[PDB]
Design an enzyme around this catalytic site. Structure first.
Site, PDB file in Angstrom:
ATOM      1  N   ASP C  53       0.857  -1.181   0.000  1.00 27.17           N
ATOM      2  CA  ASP C  53       0.000   0.000   0.000  1.00 27.17           C
ATOM      3  C   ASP C  53       0.893   1.230   0.000  1.00 27.17           C
ATOM      4  OD1 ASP C  53      -1.700   2.132   0.616  1.00 27.17           O
ATOM      5  OD2 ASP C  53      -2.671   1.124   2.305  1.00 27.17           O
ATOM      6  N   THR C  86      -6.374   1.747  -6.068  1.00 25.03           N
ATOM      7  CA  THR C  86      -4.984   1.507  -6.434  1.00 25.03           C
ATOM      8  C   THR C  86      -4.287   2.840  -6.153  1.00 25.03           C
ATOM      9  OG1 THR C  86      -5.579   1.810  -8.787  1.00 25.03           O
ATOM     10  CG2 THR C  86      -5.064  -0.442  -8.051  1.00 25.03           C
ATOM     11  N   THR C  87      -3.012   2.891  -5.797  1.00 25.75           N
ATOM     12  CA  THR C  87      -2.432   4.218  -5.541  1.00 25.75           C
ATOM     13  C   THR C  87      -2.036   4.892  -6.851  1.00 25.75           C
ATOM     14  OG1 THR C  87      -0.335   3.085  -5.001  1.00 25.75           O
ATOM     15  CG2 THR C  87      -1.638   3.951  -3.159  1.00 25.75           C
ATOM     16  N   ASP C 360      -6.600   0.167   3.320  1.00 20.85           N
ATOM     17  CA  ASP C 360      -7.295   0.763   2.185  1.00 20.85           C
ATOM     18  C   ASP C 360      -8.673   0.123   1.980  1.00 20.85           C
ATOM     19  OD1 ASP C 360      -5.179   2.464   1.670  1.00 20.85           O
ATOM     20  OD2 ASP C 360      -4.346   1.211   0.066  1.00 20.85           O
TER      21      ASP C 360
END
Lengths: 513, 489, 494, 489
Positions: C53, C86-87, C360
């Site tokens: 993450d 999703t980052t 998340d």
């Protein structure tokens, strides 16, 4: 052989850097208000050369190790059949390379991405097939002689404060140059003197040389003589050694022999009526006294390039040994005289009956900025010849580029898989040109791009970038146009080698060594 | 498209630096308290050259890589048109550059800014048709003959303490020279033996030179000659010279070049004074004065030569050895001899006369003049400042920058005076703004005064050409980056 | 020491470098074959944090001299109202900096350009409520509840081989979560693994401590006790009295468990085993805080604390075998307001991704309830928006357009990244993807299992609607702070 | 020991450099399209602070060797008196240093120019004469309460996309404040949550602390207690607390410091909420609000204590728990809470807010303002050019340079707007010259428009002392080579 090792990524990068460096210098050059680049080099040239023509300076110089010279060389073929207008072709190719950085993220097959050149074949289609160019350009033509395309080439050039008039002059030169007889014998020089006209049109060829202080000032019904071999005499191929003789009596004949060379030159020169002699090299002293009494003006060390053009001009002659005079040589006969121009003294050859060959003399302030006229002029001669018979043109000021960009964006997405990715990247390539034209005008490039696209999208092919305005306007009113071939040839060159090899769009990269 | 490269702001600086360097050297040159400058450089020059005139010194040398030489060349065309006046034109162009630091604040295309030059044209004609100033100079003229422009050119050089009287004299020289033909017959030398008058006026010609140590001291009923088996041949050449010479009574021979050694021995015994390497400029002048000669080969003596016989002698005046030609029958051409107080300022008088002949010829033909001492500059400056605010967009920063350039001239005129420059600028502006065209900078005063009373006026041709020329100078700054050459390393 | 002199172009450059270094590391973190990152530091950090993450590891530390700590901080506020998927926010912000080189080309003033971010904010909102999407997420929802975003969020994480199943479970947790309180009291821990299920869901709070090996294995009808506070012969006798007070009160209540957030005295320990009562030593305060709301809590005082002053819920408290290891379960809370989520895995210390994947994950589906709005997953949203946004740049009057168009092409990388890691050629993928989206079917998306494109809805992937609205508004502004700041005032001993 | 050697002219440079360094960070900040900056630092600093107010950031730190901290220190005296609006006072002072390069060119007396500062004072009245201020602000003010200066203060801050609405809110806070006693009893905290309003106005005081896990969730008809302060004896403290407290009906206890554990058990059973380590500053404001009490030893209960009761509760706001004190009978003191759209830029709210409190209070007390958007500055610029020509001696040169300084401000305000700066400057000059004080820079428009229609005006005080401070700063760096003072925070 030896040095400079590059492969795949690193090699692609060298191509990448060459395109970006060239784009910034050419960037200021384009459109109704461009900028001047001034160059000084060492060991092979006399001084400061300033060129607003991207093509002229690039042909002359290969400054460094990175590759760009071959791309540059090709633009010249473009000049022979169309060329100039404004230098925009180099810019389109350079921006192609920027997308390549986003391709490494993909990290697999640039070749698959590459689906675009077949798609860019479309560019050969869309860019120069839709929009009615121009048509007549009758012949000689009163008003339509200029005040249009030559002006646009010059507008991109700084000298337009007074050079717009100069451009107008150039088509007058082309009118005499049209018909049958080839593109040859056009000579132009710039003079250090300020006048409103900033240029003078001669009736023939201009040369800058004099026999000496003595000799008649002006000749009429002039006969012109050109000799390959020098007037100088003594050594011959075999010396015969330096001789000594049996008494003072026979040394005299040697001096006497010198007199004979003098004799031949006057005796048959007189029958012809010889008014002027031009020799490309060193000139023997003895004839010089003779010419003054006869009333004949000769030229010492005349430049060979002037001479070859002159032969076409006067019907020419066969140049050999002193037998060369009379019938073997042909001389035109209007007026040959030395006339002071603004400040400097020049010799004018004029009234050539044949008419194929002519010369233009430019005049100016005396600034480096003035040397700009030489760069613009060269550009203009090539522009007009092509405009007259190509019977085809496109709207300038980036009008063509924004329209094609809108059309190419549609092409992406419409095609299904594989085909779509490169086609959009090719499409964004049109966007930088709008930016290049606006930036050099002193107006915010960001603001300009947004407003520009909306007018082109509407459907007015006439509308384009107006730099004086700072926004968008009607290009046609300006009279800004680009020849059809200049735009047509570049799109094929960009999408030529590009097609078949890695057969599709997002080129080059290195190969062996 | 590359060479020595600097871009936009750095590129601008190379032009920017050249103008500031020139302005300081030239500023001290201007007006009554201007000062002489001397230059020394290595190889191909010799040693000390001193040039009061700004134009002469700049033209001679291309000292370094930064651009400025092309700007320098133009002043010469101006010089031909009218000449020197006072050197001021170079200075206006230089201060134009300082504003460019603030032109980055404008933040747009510099070529676009260039429209200000057109704006400058408005400034060029605002100066014009406003204040008619002159009517006169009919020919010879009883009172308008001087105490005018010759005095102002001389103002630049400190000789003015007694020189202005001398310059009054110079127009008399011009009146005699305007007719008959050419621009010849004027020669000026200085002698040490000070008096209040400071100048006489020789009817004949004055020359400094000597044959050699031997030869008779003085010649009377002088006659003037001017000229434009191998071993055996030389003797005959000697012999022809003496045979023709004796019958004439030849008192003096003047040759404009190197002289062969053999004749020198003959002249001494004969009793004939000859001059080696006499300058051409003096010789042409002598001919008009003596009735002329037909100068050719040794046949030149007798009838083809016309000689004036009042008297030729080498005369000591004060101290320095000189030769005096006098008693010319024609009277058309004269030589002015001025006596000074023994200082460089005395050599200063050399260029004062040169300055005077040229003005009257141009002044009579133009029929127009402007007030000198910077009077025109402040007035024009006052008019130009208003223009910048009035004009839109691009024009406003550029318009005032040119307007600003008028301000330094007032400053330059008094800085050399010996008075504080800051005080001078404010006081000057107030008088011009008020409406008195006659009022201008008075350096002797240290403040402002009536220019007309001094009599200082400037030729119309010098003012019209500089303004158009100036625009071109301002036209070669920022648009050009670096780009170095004109003369070998 | 005193040093580090930088101005104008060099100061901008420090901002430039910070963005480029971060983007490469976060670059493979987006999509099904994301890469596992593991990061450790000395001191109080502990041991095992292996981070997949991007937001979690970046927030935790500020290791070096270049400035980027503050940009990183900004992403968490986004995370609290939605965050992940999703980052991608950091990547988009970083790519904006590349055009800064072109800013000097524009050679006028950078401030005129930054106005584009405001415009970008509008661009963000006009990329939100127009150019439709799924229009599902009715509430509870038997099939669309998950197997959706979590599958894509999980896609960036390797454990997808058995974890995609885990992902389905997480929305069940949100279904209970929705209601009266807010996003509170949710605790989840990984327990390595050894079962096909790879997770058991607890009807109540999860705890991990033991008094000692001795003591009863199970408790039922359990009352829970939480306490804030932890002649020489008579003194010894007095110790017995503490034992006596604890036992006398205890038996009447029937106390089945005792939990205390501190050290526990040894004498009582013997008593609890014989009685049939299990105690917890030094239980974490945070666990207790969560627990009090859940069980109705109590008032924690001195030994008067049992009986009525304390409330004990009584469904089931036991120590159970979870795949292999033993973990305590507090469950059957009458209130139902707060719950605990339990997950497992294959075990390669890549499983620990689930420790923060989950962070998340926790916010995303809790959010899903509140939104009653969602978007198609698998990058379906990104291609559609990209097609719409390219038109949008010219749609705006100016200023807005330049930034909006660059922003539009940014979306292109996400589809590429989703299939790049998928084991399929990105180039073929990007072109085919657009044709289906431009067609007008919003259901079309990246079918990662397939290697091409397919119906995302069939697969079952949707993203929380909030992730897209906040992310777009947040991304532009987070990006703006680094580009707009030329020269950061400092002093850097280090 | 010895590393850097500086004398006279270079000394001026060190002083010169400080003005340029500060100006680049500050200039972005000025006007409706400004920027926000973050500073890390180390030691006695909790975390990085990001400051929009030039005054606040400069006061808090003295980073390096060059002298600038003292110049900075003066701006605060200005701020208590008025200060802010936008930070332009520091920028203008900095630009006067550029003329100094010109000054060495002058090569005369450096302090002769110093006269210009005296002249600067003359320049200051020049703006007052040539601009229409405002005709009102008679207290409370129904529509002109805001939507003017706060909008300009905030506009310079990007957050104005939604924050312009919160700017409007701030005047309401000042209107209640105006009256009986100084600047006190105003508390405001940012909240990390999203809503259209972006802020809430509280009639009471807001606090953020909790007694402990146990204790009643809510209290009504609340009684509030504030305190400024072997085994058997401990029991007695417990006994006094409960017995005395129960009679009053005690609902909440607030203590400014550490709290002993024994009472904590008691409060939970009793039904009383207590606060551990409550901040003293919050307490003092709270006392004015509730009518206060006398704080002493445990005899504090009953009458010596006066408690106001409306509602005291712990409420979930966004993500972070806070406690709300509401329904104050006095009404004189109030608390503001703002949320907004989050990022780095939200810590900014603590910063921006500090600026907001200062501008609005001034607006009610002064009853004087000037038009914003740079309207005041261009009109002064038209006016400034004429005066320099009129002033004698020293004064003309210096007055004109000060005068053209004003030209840059229109350019900076337009530049941040996102529109072509060159076009903007000239059009602006034409509208001001005519006589409309209302006309100004419309950044949103991209061209010049009517400022009054916008409703933007600047506090009169900010203009009076900026000119005086700018002049002292302008007296500048040239004077003394060393300055230093203080050891802040």
């Amino acid at each position: 052989a030896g040095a400079d090792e590059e492969r795949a990524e690193t090699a692609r990068l060298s191509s990448f850097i060459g395109a970006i460096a060239i784009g910034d210098l050419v960037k200021s050059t384009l459109g109704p208000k461009g900028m001047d680049k001034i160059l000084l080099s060492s060991g092979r040239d006399a001084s400061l050369m300033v060129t607003n023509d991207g093509a002229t300076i690039l042909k002359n110089i290969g400054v460094d190790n990175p590759a760009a010279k071959v791309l540059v060389d090709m633009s010249r073929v473009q000049d022979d059949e169309v060329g100039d207008g404004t230098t925009s072709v180099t810019v389109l190719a350079a921006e192609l390379l920027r997308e390549a950085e986003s391709l490494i993220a993909k990290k697999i097959h640039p070749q698959t991405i590459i689906a675009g050149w077949r798609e860019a074949t479309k560019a050969a289609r869309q860019a120069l097939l839709n929009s009615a160019v121009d048509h007549g350009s009758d012949e000689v033509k009163f008003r339509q002689d200029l005040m249009n395309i030559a002006g646009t080439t010059l507008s991109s050039k700084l000298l337009t404060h007074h050079k717009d008039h100069f451009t107008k002059l150039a088509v007058e030169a082309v009118l005499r140059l049209k018909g049958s007889g080839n593109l040859e014998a056009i000579h132009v020089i710039k003079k250090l003197g300020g006048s409103l006209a900033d240029s003078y049109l001669d009736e023939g060829f201009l040369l800058d040389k004099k026999i000496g202080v003595n000799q008649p000032k002006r000749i009429e019904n002039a006969k012109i003589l050109i000799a390959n071999t020098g007037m100088d005499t003594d050594k011959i191929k075999i010396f015969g050694s330096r001789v000594r003789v049996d008494s003072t009596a026979k040394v005299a004949e040697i001096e006497h022999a010198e007199k004979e060379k003098m004799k031949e030159k006057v005796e048959r020169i007189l029958k012809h009526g010889i008014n002027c002699f031009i020799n490309r090299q060193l000139i023997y002293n003895y004839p010089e006294q003779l010419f003054g009494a006869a009333g004949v003006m000769a030229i010492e060390h005349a430049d060979f390039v002037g001479v070859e053009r002159l032969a076409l001009v006067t019907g020419g002659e066969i140049a050999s040994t002193f037998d060369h005079p009379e019938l073997v040589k042909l001389g035109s006969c209007k007026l040959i005289e030395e006339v002071m121009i603004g400040e400097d003294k020049l010799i004018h050859f004029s009234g050539v009956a044949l008419g194929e060959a002519c010369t233009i003399v430019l005049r100016g302030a005396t600034q480096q900025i003035l040397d700009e006229a030489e760069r613009s002029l060269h550009d203009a001669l090539c522009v007009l010849a092509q405009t007259v018979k190509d019977s085809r043109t496109v709207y300038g000021g980036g009008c063509s580029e924004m329209l094609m960009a809108h059309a190419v964006t549609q092409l992406a997405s419409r095609t299904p898989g594989k085909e779509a990715v490169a086609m959009e990247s090719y499409a964004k390539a049109l966007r930088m040109l709008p930016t290049i034209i606006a930036d050099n005008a002193g107006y915010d490039s960001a603001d300009l791009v947004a407003q520009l696209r909306a007018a082109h999208s509407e459907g007015k092919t006439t509308a384009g970038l107006d730099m004086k305005e700072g926004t968008i306007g009607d290009m046609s009113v300006l009279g800004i146009t680009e020849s059809f071939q200049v735009k047509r040839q570049v799109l094929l060159s960009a999408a030529e080698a590009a097609e078949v090899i890695l057969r599709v769009d997002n080129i080059i990269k290195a190969a062996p060594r």
